[PDB]
Amino acid sequence: RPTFYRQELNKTIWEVPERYQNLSPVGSAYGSVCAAFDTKTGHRVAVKKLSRPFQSIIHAKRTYRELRLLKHMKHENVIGLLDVFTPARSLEEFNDVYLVTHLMGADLNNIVKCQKLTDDHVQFLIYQILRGLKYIHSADIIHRDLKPSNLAVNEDCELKILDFGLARHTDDEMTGYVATRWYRAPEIMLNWMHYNQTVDIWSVGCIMAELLTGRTLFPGTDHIDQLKLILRLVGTPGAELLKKISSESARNYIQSLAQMPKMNFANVFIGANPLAVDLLEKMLVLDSDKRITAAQALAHAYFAQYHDPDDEPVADPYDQSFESRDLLIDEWKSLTYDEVISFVPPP
Ligand SMILES: COc1ccc2[nH]cc(CN(C)C)c2c1
Ligand SMILES: [Cl-]
Ligand SMILES: [Cl-]
Ligand SMILES: [Cl-]
Ligand SMILES: [Cl-]
Numbered sequence: 001r002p003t004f005y006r007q008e009l010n011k012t013i014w015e016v017p018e019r020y021q022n023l024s025p026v027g028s029a030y031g032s033v034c035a036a037f038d039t040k041t042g043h044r045v046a047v048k049k050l051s052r053p054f055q056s057i058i059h060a061k062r063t064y065r066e067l068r069l070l071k072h073m074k075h076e077n078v079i080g081l082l083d084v085f086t087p088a089r090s091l092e093e094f095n096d097v098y099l100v101t102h103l104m105g106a107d108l109n110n111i112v113k114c115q116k117l118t119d120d121h122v123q124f125l126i127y128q129i130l131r132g133l134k135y136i137h138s139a140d141i142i143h144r145d146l147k148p149s150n151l152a153v154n155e156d157c158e159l160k161i162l163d164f165g166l167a168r169h170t171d172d173e174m175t176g177y178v179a180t181r182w183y184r185a186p187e188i189m190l191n192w193m194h195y196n197q198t199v200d201i202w203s204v205g206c207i208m209a210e211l212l213t214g215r216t217l218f219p220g221t222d223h224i225d226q227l228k229l230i231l232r233l234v235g236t237p238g239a240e241l242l243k244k245i246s247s248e249s250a251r252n253y254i255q256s257l258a259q260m261p262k263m264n265f266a267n268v269f270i271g272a273n274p275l276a277v278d279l280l281e282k283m284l285v286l287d288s289d290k291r292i293t294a295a296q297a298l299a300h301a302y303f304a305q306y307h308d309p310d311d312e313p314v315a316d317p318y319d320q321s322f323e324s325r326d327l328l329i330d331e332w333k334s335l336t337y338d339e340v341i342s343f344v345p346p347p
Protein backbone atom coordinates (compact mmCIF):
# COMPACT_ATOMS: atom_id res chain seq x y z
CA ARG A 1 0.00 0.00 0.00
CA PRO A 2 1.35 3.44 -0.92
CA THR A 3 1.62 6.34 1.50
CA PHE A 4 -1.26 8.84 1.17
CA TYR A 5 -1.33 12.57 1.93
CA ARG A 6 -4.32 14.84 2.62
CA GLN A 7 -5.18 18.38 1.55
CA GLU A 8 -8.22 20.62 1.17
CA LEU A 9 -8.69 22.09 -2.32
CA ASN A 10 -11.75 24.24 -3.08
CA LYS A 11 -13.66 22.99 -0.01
CA THR A 12 -12.96 19.32 -0.86
CA ILE A 13 -10.67 16.91 0.99
CA TRP A 14 -8.30 15.01 -1.31
CA GLU A 15 -6.37 12.02 0.04
CA VAL A 16 -4.09 10.56 -2.67
CA PRO A 17 -0.87 8.55 -3.01
CA GLU A 18 2.43 10.49 -2.89
CA ARG A 19 3.10 9.69 -6.55
CA TYR A 20 0.47 12.32 -7.54
CA GLN A 21 1.82 15.87 -7.19
CA ASN A 22 0.88 19.51 -7.88
CA LEU A 23 -2.89 18.94 -7.82
CA SER A 24 -4.93 21.75 -9.39
CA PRO A 25 -8.75 21.91 -9.70
CA VAL A 26 -10.08 21.82 -13.27
CA GLY A 27 -13.82 21.25 -12.98
CA SER A 28 -16.74 19.90 -10.98
CA ALA A 29 -22.66 16.34 -10.43
CA TYR A 30 -20.52 13.29 -11.17
CA GLY A 31 -17.51 14.41 -9.15
CA SER A 32 -14.63 16.85 -8.89
CA VAL A 33 -11.53 16.70 -11.11
CA CYS A 34 -7.92 17.87 -10.52
CA ALA A 35 -4.96 17.97 -12.87
CA ALA A 36 -1.79 16.38 -11.48
CA PHE A 37 1.70 15.17 -12.36
CA ASP A 38 2.17 11.41 -11.95
CA THR A 39 5.79 10.87 -10.90
CA LYS A 40 5.66 7.10 -11.50
CA THR A 41 4.80 7.33 -15.22
CA GLY A 42 5.73 10.89 -16.20
CA HIS A 43 2.24 11.71 -17.52
CA ARG A 44 -0.02 14.64 -16.77
CA VAL A 45 -3.24 13.06 -15.47
CA ALA A 46 -6.82 13.81 -14.49
CA VAL A 47 -7.79 12.60 -10.99
CA LYS A 48 -11.58 12.37 -10.44
CA LYS A 49 -13.05 11.99 -6.93
CA LEU A 50 -16.55 10.53 -7.21
CA SER A 51 -19.31 12.40 -5.37
CA ARG A 52 -21.49 10.24 -3.08
CA PRO A 53 -20.70 7.00 -4.96
CA PHE A 54 -22.87 4.78 -2.70
CA GLN A 55 -25.73 7.07 -1.66
CA SER A 56 -28.48 4.92 -3.26
CA ILE A 57 -28.85 1.57 -5.00
CA ILE A 58 -28.98 3.43 -8.33
CA HIS A 59 -25.83 5.41 -7.51
CA ALA A 60 -23.91 2.39 -6.18
CA LYS A 61 -24.71 0.39 -9.32
CA ARG A 62 -23.68 3.32 -11.54
CA THR A 63 -20.33 3.47 -9.71
CA TYR A 64 -19.75 -0.25 -10.34
CA ARG A 65 -20.82 0.12 -14.00
CA GLU A 66 -18.34 2.96 -14.67
CA LEU A 67 -15.42 1.16 -13.00
CA ARG A 68 -16.07 -2.12 -14.90
CA LEU A 69 -16.29 -0.26 -18.21
CA LEU A 70 -13.11 1.79 -17.72
CA LYS A 71 -11.14 -1.27 -16.53
CA HIS A 72 -12.06 -3.09 -19.75
CA MET A 73 -11.14 -0.48 -22.40
CA LYS A 74 -7.64 -1.13 -23.88
CA HIS A 75 -7.44 0.57 -27.32
CA GLU A 76 -5.49 3.48 -28.87
CA ASN A 77 -8.65 5.43 -29.78
CA VAL A 78 -10.53 4.92 -26.46
CA ILE A 79 -9.81 6.44 -23.04
CA GLY A 80 -8.39 3.85 -20.65
CA LEU A 81 -7.81 3.60 -16.90
CA LEU A 82 -4.34 4.48 -15.62
CA ASP A 83 -5.14 3.86 -11.93
CA VAL A 84 -7.93 3.55 -9.35
CA PHE A 85 -7.50 3.93 -5.59
CA THR A 86 -9.16 4.43 -2.18
CA PRO A 87 -7.48 5.54 1.08
CA ALA A 88 -9.61 2.96 2.93
CA ARG A 89 -7.71 0.08 4.55
CA SER A 90 -10.74 -2.25 4.76
CA LEU A 91 -14.20 -2.79 3.30
CA GLU A 92 -15.60 -1.59 6.63
CA GLU A 93 -14.18 1.93 6.17
CA PHE A 94 -14.54 2.03 2.34
CA ASN A 95 -16.27 5.25 1.24
CA ASP A 96 -14.34 7.13 -1.49
CA VAL A 97 -13.33 6.16 -5.04
CA TYR A 98 -10.75 7.98 -7.21
CA LEU A 99 -10.22 7.38 -10.96
CA VAL A 100 -7.05 8.40 -12.84
CA THR A 101 -6.87 8.95 -16.64
CA HIS A 102 -4.67 10.76 -19.17
CA LEU A 103 -5.28 14.51 -18.97
CA MET A 104 -7.16 15.71 -22.04
CA GLY A 105 -6.86 19.19 -23.51
CA ALA A 106 -8.70 20.15 -26.66
CA ASP A 107 -11.85 18.42 -27.84
CA LEU A 108 -13.29 18.27 -31.35
CA ASN A 109 -15.38 21.39 -30.60
CA ASN A 110 -12.25 23.54 -30.46
CA ILE A 111 -10.95 22.14 -33.75
CA VAL A 112 -14.28 22.33 -35.61
CA LYS A 113 -14.82 26.01 -34.74
CA CYS A 114 -11.21 27.28 -34.88
CA GLN A 115 -9.46 25.40 -37.72
CA LYS A 116 -9.63 25.12 -41.51
CA LEU A 117 -9.89 21.37 -42.06
CA THR A 118 -8.74 19.74 -45.27
CA ASP A 119 -10.48 16.63 -46.58
CA ASP A 120 -7.41 14.70 -45.37
CA HIS A 121 -8.10 15.90 -41.82
CA VAL A 122 -11.72 14.69 -42.02
CA GLN A 123 -10.61 11.28 -43.31
CA PHE A 124 -8.15 10.78 -40.42
CA LEU A 125 -10.48 12.04 -37.68
CA ILE A 126 -13.50 9.95 -38.74
CA TYR A 127 -11.24 6.91 -39.40
CA GLN A 128 -10.10 6.99 -35.77
CA ILE A 129 -13.66 7.26 -34.41
CA LEU A 130 -14.72 4.21 -36.47
CA ARG A 131 -11.61 2.24 -35.41
CA GLY A 132 -12.48 2.82 -31.74
CA LEU A 133 -16.17 2.02 -32.38
CA LYS A 134 -15.34 -1.29 -34.09
CA TYR A 135 -13.51 -2.23 -30.87
CA ILE A 136 -16.30 -0.96 -28.56
CA HIS A 137 -19.08 -2.67 -30.53
CA SER A 138 -17.18 -5.98 -30.70
CA ALA A 139 -17.69 -6.25 -26.91
CA ASP A 140 -21.45 -5.49 -27.28
CA ILE A 141 -21.01 -2.06 -25.65
CA ILE A 142 -23.05 0.94 -26.88
CA HIS A 143 -21.52 4.38 -26.27
CA ARG A 144 -24.87 6.28 -26.60
CA ASP A 145 -23.46 9.84 -26.19
CA LEU A 146 -21.03 10.47 -29.04
CA LYS A 147 -20.67 14.22 -29.75
CA PRO A 148 -17.75 16.65 -30.34
CA SER A 149 -17.20 17.44 -26.63
CA ASN A 150 -16.68 13.70 -25.93
CA LEU A 151 -13.80 13.36 -28.44
CA ALA A 152 -10.31 14.41 -27.32
CA VAL A 153 -7.82 15.58 -29.99
CA ASN A 154 -4.15 16.61 -29.76
CA GLU A 155 -1.86 18.72 -31.95
CA ASP A 156 -1.07 15.72 -34.21
CA CYS A 157 -4.79 15.09 -34.99
CA GLU A 158 -4.81 11.93 -32.83
CA LEU A 159 -8.22 11.18 -31.28
CA LYS A 160 -9.69 9.31 -28.26
CA ILE A 161 -13.35 8.53 -27.40
CA LEU A 162 -14.37 9.31 -23.79
CA ASP A 163 -17.37 9.86 -21.45
CA PHE A 164 -19.37 6.71 -22.20
CA GLY A 165 -23.09 7.00 -21.59
CA LEU A 166 -23.78 5.54 -18.15
CA ALA A 167 -27.58 6.06 -18.52
CA ARG A 168 -27.21 9.44 -16.79
CA HIS A 169 -28.88 12.09 -18.96
CA THR A 170 -32.10 13.59 -17.57
CA ASP A 171 -35.22 15.01 -19.22
CA ASP A 172 -34.21 18.60 -18.46
CA GLU A 173 -30.78 18.00 -20.01
CA MET A 174 -32.33 17.03 -23.38
CA THR A 175 -34.80 19.96 -23.59
CA GLY A 176 -34.71 22.86 -26.03
CA TYR A 177 -31.86 24.23 -28.15
CA VAL A 178 -29.08 22.01 -26.75
CA ALA A 179 -26.12 20.10 -28.23
CA THR A 180 -26.86 17.23 -25.81
CA ARG A 181 -29.64 16.14 -28.26
CA TRP A 182 -28.41 17.28 -31.71
CA TYR A 183 -26.32 14.10 -32.23
CA ARG A 184 -28.89 11.47 -31.08
CA ALA A 185 -30.57 8.99 -33.43
CA PRO A 186 -34.32 9.68 -33.88
CA GLU A 187 -35.39 6.26 -32.53
CA ILE A 188 -33.71 6.96 -29.18
CA MET A 189 -34.64 10.67 -29.06
CA LEU A 190 -38.34 9.73 -29.26
CA ASN A 191 -38.28 6.23 -27.69
CA TRP A 192 -39.51 4.58 -30.91
CA MET A 193 -38.16 1.10 -30.16
CA HIS A 194 -35.49 -0.86 -28.35
CA TYR A 195 -32.22 0.57 -29.66
CA ASN A 196 -28.89 -1.11 -30.40
CA GLN A 197 -25.32 -0.17 -31.37
CA THR A 198 -26.51 1.41 -34.66
CA VAL A 199 -27.39 4.59 -32.73
CA ASP A 200 -23.65 5.37 -32.50
CA ILE A 201 -23.27 5.31 -36.32
CA TRP A 202 -26.02 7.96 -36.62
CA SER A 203 -23.93 10.14 -34.28
CA VAL A 204 -20.78 9.67 -36.38
CA GLY A 205 -22.74 10.81 -39.46
CA CYS A 206 -23.81 14.00 -37.67
CA ILE A 207 -20.19 14.64 -36.56
CA MET A 208 -18.74 13.98 -40.05
CA ALA A 209 -21.22 16.37 -41.69
CA GLU A 210 -20.27 19.11 -39.19
CA LEU A 211 -16.53 18.65 -39.91
CA LEU A 212 -17.23 19.07 -43.64
CA THR A 213 -19.50 22.16 -43.42
CA GLY A 214 -18.46 23.82 -40.16
CA ARG A 215 -22.15 23.78 -39.11
CA THR A 216 -24.40 21.63 -36.90
CA LEU A 217 -26.37 19.20 -39.10
CA PHE A 218 -29.63 19.04 -37.06
CA PRO A 219 -29.71 22.02 -34.60
CA GLY A 220 -33.31 21.60 -33.47
CA THR A 221 -34.96 24.01 -31.04
CA ASP A 222 -36.85 21.02 -29.46
CA HIS A 223 -37.50 17.30 -30.13
CA ILE A 224 -40.22 17.97 -32.75
CA ASP A 225 -38.33 20.70 -34.62
CA GLN A 226 -35.29 18.40 -34.74
CA LEU A 227 -37.37 15.51 -36.14
CA LYS A 228 -38.66 17.80 -38.90
CA LEU A 229 -35.08 18.76 -39.85
CA ILE A 230 -34.10 15.06 -39.94
CA LEU A 231 -37.05 13.92 -42.09
CA ARG A 232 -36.53 16.75 -44.59
CA LEU A 233 -33.03 15.40 -45.31
CA VAL A 234 -33.55 11.61 -45.19
CA GLY A 235 -37.26 11.36 -46.12
CA THR A 236 -40.34 10.30 -44.18
CA PRO A 237 -40.57 6.61 -43.19
CA GLY A 238 -42.05 3.89 -45.35
CA ALA A 239 -44.41 1.15 -44.19
CA GLU A 240 -41.49 -1.20 -43.51
CA LEU A 241 -40.02 1.05 -40.80
CA LEU A 242 -43.44 2.07 -39.43
CA LYS A 243 -43.98 -1.63 -38.61
CA LYS A 244 -40.96 -1.45 -36.28
CA ILE A 245 -42.12 1.49 -34.13
CA SER A 246 -43.69 0.03 -30.99
CA SER A 247 -45.63 3.08 -29.78
CA GLU A 248 -48.97 3.25 -31.56
CA SER A 249 -49.12 6.93 -30.62
CA ALA A 250 -45.69 7.60 -32.12
CA ARG A 251 -46.79 5.73 -35.26
CA ASN A 252 -49.91 7.90 -35.37
CA TYR A 253 -47.87 11.10 -35.04
CA ILE A 254 -45.49 10.06 -37.85
CA GLN A 255 -48.39 9.40 -40.22
CA SER A 256 -49.73 12.87 -39.42
CA LEU A 257 -46.81 14.40 -41.37
CA ALA A 258 -46.91 15.03 -45.12
CA GLN A 259 -44.65 12.64 -47.00
CA MET A 260 -41.21 13.86 -48.19
CA PRO A 261 -38.54 12.22 -50.39
CA LYS A 262 -34.90 11.79 -49.43
CA MET A 263 -32.85 14.81 -50.61
CA ASN A 264 -29.84 14.78 -52.97
CA PHE A 265 -26.81 14.77 -50.61
CA ALA A 266 -24.45 16.16 -53.30
CA ASN A 267 -26.60 19.31 -53.37
CA VAL A 268 -26.56 19.56 -49.54
CA PHE A 269 -22.81 19.01 -49.01
CA ILE A 270 -21.74 21.19 -51.91
CA GLY A 271 -18.17 20.61 -53.06
CA ALA A 272 -17.40 17.71 -50.71
CA ASN A 273 -15.42 14.65 -51.81
CA PRO A 274 -17.90 12.37 -53.66
CA LEU A 275 -16.66 9.45 -51.54
CA ALA A 276 -17.50 11.41 -48.38
CA VAL A 277 -21.01 12.10 -49.72
CA ASP A 278 -21.45 8.38 -50.43
CA LEU A 279 -20.42 7.39 -46.89
CA LEU A 280 -22.79 9.95 -45.33
CA GLU A 281 -25.70 8.47 -47.32
CA LYS A 282 -24.87 5.06 -45.81
CA MET A 283 -24.64 6.31 -42.19
CA LEU A 284 -27.66 8.65 -42.14
CA VAL A 285 -30.33 6.03 -42.86
CA LEU A 286 -33.60 6.37 -40.94
CA ASP A 287 -34.12 2.59 -40.48
CA SER A 288 -31.39 1.53 -38.04
CA ASP A 289 -31.36 -2.04 -39.43
CA LYS A 290 -30.01 -0.65 -42.72
CA ARG A 291 -27.19 1.65 -41.54
CA ILE A 292 -23.58 0.73 -42.32
CA THR A 293 -21.69 -0.85 -39.39
CA ALA A 294 -18.33 0.35 -38.05
CA ALA A 295 -16.51 -2.69 -39.46
CA GLN A 296 -18.11 -2.16 -42.88
CA ALA A 297 -17.34 1.60 -42.87
CA LEU A 298 -13.61 1.05 -42.23
CA ALA A 299 -13.41 -0.78 -45.59
CA HIS A 300 -15.11 2.09 -47.48
CA ALA A 301 -12.99 3.68 -50.20
CA TYR A 302 -13.06 7.08 -48.44
CA PHE A 303 -10.49 5.65 -45.96
CA ALA A 304 -8.20 4.00 -48.55
CA GLN A 305 -5.17 5.94 -47.30
CA TYR A 306 -5.49 4.76 -43.66
CA HIS A 307 -7.32 1.38 -43.66
CA ASP A 308 -5.23 -1.59 -42.48
CA PRO A 309 -7.29 -4.70 -41.64
CA ASP A 310 -4.32 -6.11 -39.66
CA ASP A 311 -4.24 -3.04 -37.36
CA GLU A 312 -7.93 -2.63 -36.43
CA PRO A 313 -8.32 -4.87 -33.36
CA VAL A 314 -11.38 -6.20 -31.56
CA ALA A 315 -12.02 -6.39 -27.80
CA ASP A 316 -11.91 -9.21 -25.29
CA PRO A 317 -15.40 -10.46 -24.33
CA TYR A 318 -17.25 -8.23 -21.82
CA ASP A 319 -19.68 -9.84 -19.32
CA GLN A 320 -22.59 -7.44 -18.64
CA SER A 321 -24.81 -9.87 -16.73
CA PHE A 322 -24.65 -7.62 -13.64
CA GLU A 323 -27.02 -5.17 -15.40
CA SER A 324 -30.05 -7.42 -14.85
CA ARG A 325 -29.03 -8.28 -11.28
CA ASP A 326 -30.88 -7.01 -8.19
CA LEU A 327 -28.59 -6.26 -5.24
CA LEU A 328 -28.47 -4.18 -2.06
CA ILE A 329 -26.30 -1.06 -1.62
CA ASP A 330 -23.68 -2.85 0.46
CA GLU A 331 -23.48 -5.69 -2.12
CA TRP A 332 -22.79 -3.26 -5.00
CA LYS A 333 -20.26 -1.55 -2.71
CA SER A 334 -18.49 -4.84 -1.98
CA LEU A 335 -18.29 -5.70 -5.70
CA THR A 336 -16.82 -2.25 -6.36
CA TYR A 337 -14.24 -2.70 -3.56
CA ASP A 338 -13.15 -6.02 -5.10
CA GLU A 339 -12.55 -4.31 -8.47
CA VAL A 340 -10.54 -1.46 -6.89
CA ILE A 341 -8.13 -3.80 -5.09
CA SER A 342 -7.71 -6.18 -8.07
CA PHE A 343 -6.68 -3.44 -10.54
CA VAL A 344 -3.43 -4.07 -12.42
CA PRO A 345 -1.86 -1.06 -14.20
CA PRO A 346 -0.89 -1.05 -17.88
CA PRO A 347 2.76 -1.86 -18.86
C1 LIG B 1 -4.09 15.61 -25.26
O1 LIG B 1 -5.18 14.98 -25.94
C2 LIG B 1 -4.88 13.77 -26.54
C3 LIG B 1 -5.84 13.32 -27.50
C4 LIG B 1 -5.62 12.17 -28.21
C5 LIG B 1 -4.42 11.48 -27.97
N1 LIG B 1 -3.91 10.31 -28.56
C6 LIG B 1 -2.67 10.02 -28.00
C7 LIG B 1 -2.37 10.98 -27.03
C8 LIG B 1 -1.20 11.15 -26.12
N2 LIG B 1 -1.22 10.11 -24.96
C9 LIG B 1 0.07 10.19 -24.15
C10 LIG B 1 -2.41 10.39 -24.03
C11 LIG B 1 -3.47 11.91 -27.01
C12 LIG B 1 -3.71 13.09 -26.27
CL1 LIG C 1 2.90 6.69 -4.14
CL1 LIG D 1 -5.75 6.10 -22.62
CL1 LIG E 1 -12.47 5.77 1.92
CL1 LIG F 1 -20.77 18.68 -28.08
Ligand SMILES: [Cl-]
Binds near residue numbers: 257258259
Ligand atom coordinates in the same frame (compact mmCIF):
# COMPACT_ATOMS: atom_id res chain seq x y z
CL1 LIG G 1 -48.56 13.66 -47.97
Ligand SMILES: [Cl-]
Binds near residue numbers: 317318319320
Ligand atom coordinates in the same frame (compact mmCIF):
# COMPACT_ATOMS: atom_id res chain seq x y z
CL1 LIG H 1 -15.90 -9.60 -18.58
Ligand SMILES: [Mg+2]
Binds near residue numbers: 149150163
Ligand atom coordinates in the same frame (compact mmCIF):
# COMPACT_ATOMS: atom_id res chain seq x y z
MG1 LIG I 1 -18.54 14.88 -21.76
